Amino acid sequence: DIQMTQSPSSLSASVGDRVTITCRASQDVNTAVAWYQQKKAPKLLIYSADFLRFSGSRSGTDFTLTISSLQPEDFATYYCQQHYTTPPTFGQGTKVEI
């Protein structure tokens, strides 16, 4: 069962900063990583480490969600998920307080 590890657990940024969330995985997941946003039900933002200010990118053995200009409507918890194999597994979430 592959682990998704999210960094960080919580963060506070200003309603204007760029913010970056990292997700690491315990086994290779190719590019099969999604990022979900939960404010409310979860909403797919990025599927497959890129596809839709919210920018997704793979940095070596680390995935990153980057919010170029935080707006107060982006106050949420973001989860990373690997859709590489079964069972699907998710990180613990990172709450973003603005």
Binding site: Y36, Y79, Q81, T86, P88, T89, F90
Partner: peptide, 17 residues
């Protein structure tokens, strides 16, 4: 179809498909 759950103060946990 999947069910995923979120316990208070835990992340998302896939439960069944």
């Amino acid at each position: 179809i999947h069910w995923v759950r979120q316990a208070p103060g835990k992340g998302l946990e896939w439960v069944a498909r």
